[PDB]
Design a protein around this motif. Structure first.
Motif, PDB file in Angstrom:
ATOM      1  N   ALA A   1       0.769  -1.205   0.000  1.00  0.00           N
ATOM      2  CA  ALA A   1       0.000   0.000   0.000  1.00  0.00           C
ATOM      3  C   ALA A   1       0.807   1.265   0.000  1.00  0.00           C
ATOM      4  O   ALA A   1       0.416   2.263  -0.605  1.00  0.00           O
ATOM      5  N   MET A   2       1.982   1.241   0.718  1.00  0.00           N
ATOM      6  CA  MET A   2       2.706   2.520   0.904  1.00  0.00           C
ATOM      7  C   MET A   2       3.433   2.835  -0.328  1.00  0.00           C
ATOM      8  O   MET A   2       3.345   3.963  -0.790  1.00  0.00           O
ATOM      9  N   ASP A   3       4.119   1.777  -0.956  1.00  0.00           N
ATOM     10  CA  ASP A   3       4.751   1.901  -2.277  1.00  0.00           C
ATOM     11  C   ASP A   3       3.753   2.263  -3.406  1.00  0.00           C
ATOM     12  O   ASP A   3       4.140   3.041  -4.267  1.00  0.00           O
ATOM     13  N   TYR A   4       2.460   1.818  -3.320  1.00  0.00           N
ATOM     14  CA  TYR A   4       1.329   2.134  -4.138  1.00  0.00           C
ATOM     15  C   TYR A   4       0.925   3.591  -4.013  1.00  0.00           C
ATOM     16  O   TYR A   4       0.764   4.231  -5.022  1.00  0.00           O
ATOM     17  N   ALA A   5       0.828   4.094  -2.781  1.00  0.00           N
ATOM     18  CA  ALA A   5       0.512   5.459  -2.469  1.00  0.00           C
ATOM     19  C   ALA A   5       1.575   6.464  -3.073  1.00  0.00           C
ATOM     20  O   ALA A   5       1.181   7.426  -3.781  1.00  0.00           O
ATOM     21  N   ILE A   6       2.942   6.324  -2.902  1.00  0.00           N
ATOM     22  CA  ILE A   6       3.970   7.243  -3.344  1.00  0.00           C
ATOM     23  C   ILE A   6       4.175   7.360  -4.862  1.00  0.00           C
ATOM     24  O   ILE A   6       4.750   8.368  -5.230  1.00  0.00           O
TER      25      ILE A   6
END
Lengths: 71, 266, 89, 475
Positions: free
Chosen positions: B257-262
């Motif tokens: 999710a975090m790599d998806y968000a950035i």
């Protein structure tokens, strides 16, 4: 034809053949380098022993291989 | 000298061959210095090349008996394009046939089946199409039965191959040991447990001391008089979890999710 | 022409006087046409009809038991009689 | 007649080139100046051939040459001398303007920019002799022109682009002689040929010129397949360095088709199968890759069988030809039933064809996989089936013989099953529901990552046409 004759000479355990291996390899270091990379560890081994005078030759050859790959 | 090596092989004394090798390898240099090593061929070149090759041929067989695999592999690499070039320019020996066939078995036992399949391609264009068999059927048939997955057929041919000589006797022992390690891998997934008399039949052994030694190498208790294949599977999984090469392969859901968000906010 | 047909290859990357030379380079490096190696060499061509919609290259969809013969009329016929023999034995 | 027609033809040829020399020297835009040469090559040759092919000789004199002239003249002599038909004032005019080559560079000879013009010329002659076919010496003559052009004209990125076609034909002419017959010339020259192209490849790396690197790669890889020395082809693909920036779509197919073959002989049939589907996707097709595309279909079917899960009978009918795929339709069927005799009859029958296509080596393993895929239909159909029942079906020696074949296949993953020896049956393992497992999260990850990449790429490619147009001469 492959570098297969050139690699075989290094592995041979008689000291006179090891010296001889690098004399041939040295010429074709820039021309074949994707077939002389199996026995690159044979060439790093010869540096370690100080009983060889082919410490010089082993480094000279060795550096060049890394650049041909593009490292 | 080069000559003494050759008659020592026909005498039948391979200890003798073995102890002429250290001088032999120094003169083998001289022989290489004679020739231009395949960049111009002459007819004076072939008289110089007979002196070169001779060493390689005799040397190569003699290494099989003496357990000098590095030298057999070395003499093979030198010798081989000589035969290949011009459909033979001569560059031919009777001894040629034995080296191709024994060299195929050498790879197989090391489990360079990768190289086995590469090495085959070369030899088919070379002699398999043109001179028919040099006793090449012997390696190719073992390979087929490993890939087919029948180990009965293959084990049977090894039993017969030690009732025959072409120097296949010296490689059958190795290919016996090699087959035994391969079936343990297959039989983890197949069985959960087996009688000690059943594991004995399947992985081929003549003592129960051999069957349990083989079991405890693969870390399977032999308690209750049954094997327990699952026990090794647990310990391979733990080995993997301790490393940090297995944690990011999984990819956790916080990370995804975090790599998806950035990417979006970039 | 397998999974990913010849139509998608002409519509995605458009055939141009620009691309043809490059395509010639693909064919030549492989060496020759191997469309034309088979009807000269073999003096035969591919599959032909057997009832229509079963075999032969077509936009007709086919069966997966096409090669298997129709003896099925027999087998249902034999199935009834054989079944009376077992039950009524 | 002759004197006029050749006159006008020589001077037109010089002018078209001089413009695309200029075009490439103005910033970088690699692909478009190149494409001009590809459309041109095809046309220039056909115009030279009508009205006698000594229209090329006028062009050959109207370049500064190192030794092209002698090689070209010989052909004219052979079809009856045409050196009195192409004569000066109509085969040699530098003039006082550039449109038959600039006068100021020609006299001075140290400012000359004749280079790329010269490369396009050579290519024309090599092609005519290539059509006709000549071998041995033909390889030598080509090889002798080409190396001088690297060495009298300084190397640029721009130079490597057009001499990238020169490389193709030397390499190609040597492989066709090599497969014809071995020869004293072929054994020796193979060493030079293999090495020299490997020597340009790192220089291409240094240049940062992605088009150049790809073409040298494809040529090395191909020689290994032709003579079967694939012990090398393996070492070649340990490394990766193939670019995809200035590499054409036509080329990307080229890499993937051959790569697919090397992976099949390390006995990893998973990434072989990946790259053959992949190869078709990059590949364009019209009619000029028809041979390549035919073999693409054949190779895919061999790979799918190696893995142990049959392709359909419908799979070949729904291919838009079966008119050379007629042997490999028979191969799907023979593996499929678990029948050994059918495999023997076809492999002998089509022996010459298999030998040519480098698919004969795979058929020694596919003899082995007759039985291995024979199991695959039966264990799938029946969840639980006794050891003895499978001896019925596939006519196997012993119950124990069954267990061995299946056990191998399940380590290779083909069956997905487990043998139970205390209850005397094989139980085909379930797949269950994977919707409640973490498997769909892996599939999505692939999809998500590719889609993010497309949104970033488009924004860069807004800008690129705008540069091309601004540079371009008014409309």
């Amino acid at each position: 034809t492959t570098a297969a004759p050139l690699l075989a000479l290094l592995r041979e355990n008689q000291d006179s053949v090891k010296t001889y291996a690098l004399e041939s390899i040295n010429n074709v270091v820039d021309q074949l380098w994707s077939e002389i990379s199996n026995e690159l560890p044979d060439i790093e081994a010869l540096y370690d022993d100080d009983t060889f005078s082919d410490r010089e030759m082993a480094a000279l050859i060795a550096s060049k291989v890394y650049y041909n790959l593009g490292e | 000298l080069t000559k003494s090596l050759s008659i020592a092989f026909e005498n039948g004394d391979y200890a003798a061959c073995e102890k002429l090798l250290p001088p032999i390898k120094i003169e083998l240099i001289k022989n290489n210095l004679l020739i231009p090593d395949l960049s111009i061929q002459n007819d004076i070149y072939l008289n110089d090349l007979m002196i070169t090759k001779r060493i390689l041929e005799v040397g190569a067989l003699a290494s099989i008996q003496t357990f000098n695999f590095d030298s057999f592999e070395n003499y093979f690499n030198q010798l081989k394009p000589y035969y290949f070039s011009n459909n033979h320019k001569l560059s031919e020996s009777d001894k040629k046939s034995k080296l191709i066939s024994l060299y195929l078995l050498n790879l197989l036992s090391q489990n360079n089946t990768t190289k086995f399949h590469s090495e085959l391609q070369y030899l088919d264009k070379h002699i398999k199409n043109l001179e028919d068999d040099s006793l090449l059927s012997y390696p190719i048939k073992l390979d087929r039965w490993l890939m087919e997955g029948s180990y009965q057929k293959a084990w049977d041919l090894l039993q017969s191959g030690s009732q025959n000589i072409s120097e296949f006797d010296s490689f059958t022992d190795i290919l016996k040991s090699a087959i035994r390690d391969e079936i343990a891998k297959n039989t983890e997934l197949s069985y959960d447990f087996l009688p000690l008399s059943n594991i004995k039949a399947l992985l081929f052994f003549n003592n129960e001391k051999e069957t349990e030694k083989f079991a405890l190498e693969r870390n399977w208790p032999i308690v209750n008089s049954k094997v327990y294949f699952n026990n090794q599977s647990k310990e391979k999984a733990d080995y993997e979890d301790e490393m940090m090469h297995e944690e990011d392969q999984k990819t956790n859901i916080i990370e995804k999710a975090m790599d998806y968000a950035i990417s979006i906010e970039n | 022409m397998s999974t990913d047909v010849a139509a998608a290859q002409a519509q995605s990357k458009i055939d141009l006087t620009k691309k043809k030379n490059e395509e010639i380079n693909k064919k030549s490096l492989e060496e020759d046409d191997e469309f034309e190696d088979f009807p000269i060499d073999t003096w035969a061509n591919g599959e032909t009809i057997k009832s229509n919609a079963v075999t032969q290259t077509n936009i007709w969809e086919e069966n997966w038991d096409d090669v298997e013969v129709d003896d099925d009329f027999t087998n249902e016929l034999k199935a009834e009689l054989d079944r009376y023999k077992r039950e009524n034995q | 007649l002759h004197h006029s027609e050749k006159k006008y033809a020589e001077e037109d040829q010089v002018q078209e080139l001089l413009k695309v020399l200029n075009e490439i020297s103005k910033t970088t835009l690699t692909l478009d100046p190149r494409y001009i040469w590809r459309s041109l090559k095809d046309l220039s040759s056909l115009r030279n051939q009508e009205l006698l092919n000594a229209e090329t000789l006028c062009f050959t004199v109207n370049v500064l040459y190192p030794d092209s002239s002698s090689f070209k003249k010989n052909l004219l002599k052979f079809i009856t001398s045409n050196h009195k038909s192409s004569v000066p004032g109509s085969a040699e005019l530098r003039n006082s303007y550039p449109a038959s080559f600039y006068s100021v560079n020609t006299e001075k000879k140290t400012i000359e920019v004749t280079a790329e013009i010269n490369c396009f010329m050579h290519l024309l002659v090599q092609l005519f002799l290539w059509d006709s076919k000549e071998l041995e010496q033909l390889v030598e003559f080509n090889r002798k022109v080409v190396i001088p052009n690297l060495l009298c004209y300084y190397n640029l990125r721009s130079l490597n682009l057009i001499n990238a076609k020169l490389w193709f034909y030397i390499y190609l002419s040597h492989e066709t002689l090599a497969r014809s017959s071995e020869e004293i010339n072929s054994d020796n020259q193979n060493i030079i040929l293999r090495s020299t192209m490997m020597k340009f490849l790192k220089i291409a790396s240094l240049k940062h010129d992605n088009e150049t690197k790809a073409m040298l790669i494809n040529l090395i890889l191909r020689d290994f397949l032709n003579n079967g020395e694939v012990d090398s082809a393996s070492d070649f693909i340990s490394k990766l360095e193939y670019p995809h920036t200035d590499v054409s779509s036509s080329l990307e197919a080229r890499y993937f088709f051959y790569l697919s073959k090397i992976n099949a002989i390390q006995l990893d049939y998973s990434t072989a199968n990946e790259y053959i589907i992949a190869a078709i996707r990059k590949a364009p097709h019209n009619s000029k890759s028809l041979g390549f595309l035919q073999q693409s279909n054949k190779l895919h079917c061999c790979i799918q069988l190696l893995m142990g899960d049959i392709p359909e009978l419908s799979f070949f009918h729904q291919s838009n030809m079966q008119k050379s795929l007629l042997p490999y339709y028979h191969l799907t069927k023979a593996v499929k039933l678990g029948d050994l005799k059918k495999f023997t009859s076809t492999i002998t029958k089509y022996k010459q064809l298999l030998l040519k296509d480098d698919t004969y080596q795979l058929c020694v393993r596919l003899r082995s996989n007759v039985i291995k895929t024979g199991i695959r239909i039966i264990s799938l159909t029946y969840k639980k089936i006794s050891l003895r029942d499978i001896c019925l079906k596939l006519n196997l020696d012993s119950e124990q013989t069954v267990e061995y074949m299946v056990s191998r296949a399940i380590r290779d993953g083909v069956i997905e099953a487990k043998i139970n020896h205390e209850d005397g049956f094989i139980e085909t393992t379930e797949l269950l529901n994977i919707y409640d497992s973490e498997d769909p999260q892996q599939v999505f990850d692939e999809r998500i990552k590719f889609a993010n990449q497309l949104h970033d790429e488009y924004l860069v490619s807004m800008r690129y046409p705008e540069d091309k147009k601004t540079q371009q001469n008014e409309k």
